[PDB]
Design a protein around this motif. Structure first.
Motif: not given
Ligand code: HEM
Ligand SMILES: OC[C@H]1O[C@H](O[C@H]2O[C@H](CO)[C@@H](O)[C@H](O)[C@H]2O)[C@H](O)[C@@H](O)[C@@H]1O
Length: 153
Positions: A39, A42-43, A45, A64, A68, A71-72, A89, A92-93, A97, A99, A103, A107, A111
């Motif tokens: 997991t 995927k980032f 950064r 970050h 996250v 937002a949740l 959400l 973008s995902h 991203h 995801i 995955y 997460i 949690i």
């Molecule tokens: C509870 C589930 C999750 C929530 C609420 C969540 C929320 C967010 C939010 C609000 C952002 C910033 C805005 C956007 O890009 O949409 C973000 C970015 C991102 N999320 Fe998630 N996400 C979730 C799960 C995941 C998981 C499990 C992964 C990876 C295995 C993931 C990977 C990413 C990546 C790669 C970014 C960009 C990071 C960066 O700014 O460099 N997310 N996520």
């Protein structure tokens, strides 16, 4: 569909998370990246972080986690009426991203593990069950949106 009683169990434990969202986010990341290392890849950064120490010391990763979890939290407070919150959400995902639902399950597990550990006072069996139900609803609705956006998930 969760009952009001179930939503209250979810919101009561989240109230504790909100005493220090940053700290809870750090524990959640460490838990996730250690339980399922793939997991982290995927980032772009954060994929360079090699150890728990590095993860904990990362100010950006901490920031970050706040993003996250906030937002949740907003989604959970909608108590199922999160259509508006899921749109950006899911987009973008799914598209950027990429995801998989798997995955999101990882997460969700992280949690629950952290809440179980830090909050035995508000995370007994019934509370954990309600939180799981809420997270399953979240993933179910995200999966449906993924489908509409053209992503297999
Ligand atoms: C509870 C589930 C999750 C929530 C609420 C969540 C929320 C967010 C939010 C609000 C952002 C910033 C805005 C956007 O890009 O949409 C973000 C970015 C991102 N999320 Fe998630 N996400 C979730 C799960 C995941 C998981 C499990 C992964 C990876 C295995 C993931 C990977 C990413 C990546 C790669 C970014 C960009 C990071 C960066 O700014 O460099 N997310 N996520
Ligand atoms: O609670 C354990 C089960 O977790 C997953 O399944 C739940 O969430 C999926 C969405 O992420 C739903 O499709 C499934 O219907 C839910 O039960 C996991 O995929 C299952 O193998 C686990 O048993």
């Amino acid at each position: 569909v969760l009952s009001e009683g179930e939503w209250q169990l979810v919101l009561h434990v989240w109230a504790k998370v909100e005493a220090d969202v940053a700290g809870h986010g750090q524990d959640i990341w460490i838990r996730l990246f250690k339980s399922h290392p793939e997991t982290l890849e995927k980032f772009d950064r954060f994929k360079h972080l090699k150890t728990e120490a590095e993860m904990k010391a990362s100010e950006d990763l901490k920031k970050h986690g706040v993003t996250v979890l906030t937002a949740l939290g907003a989604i959970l407070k909608k108590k199922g009426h999160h259509e508006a919150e899921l749109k950006p959400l899911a987009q973008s995902h799914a598209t950027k991203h990429k995801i998989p639902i798997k995955y999101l399950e990882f997460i969700s597990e992280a949690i629950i593990h952290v809440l179980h550990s830090r909050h035995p006072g508000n995370f007994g069996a019934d509370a954990q069950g309600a939180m799981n139900k809420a997270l399953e609803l979240f993933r179910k609705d995200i999966a449906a949106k993924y489908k509409e956006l053209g992503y297999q998930g």
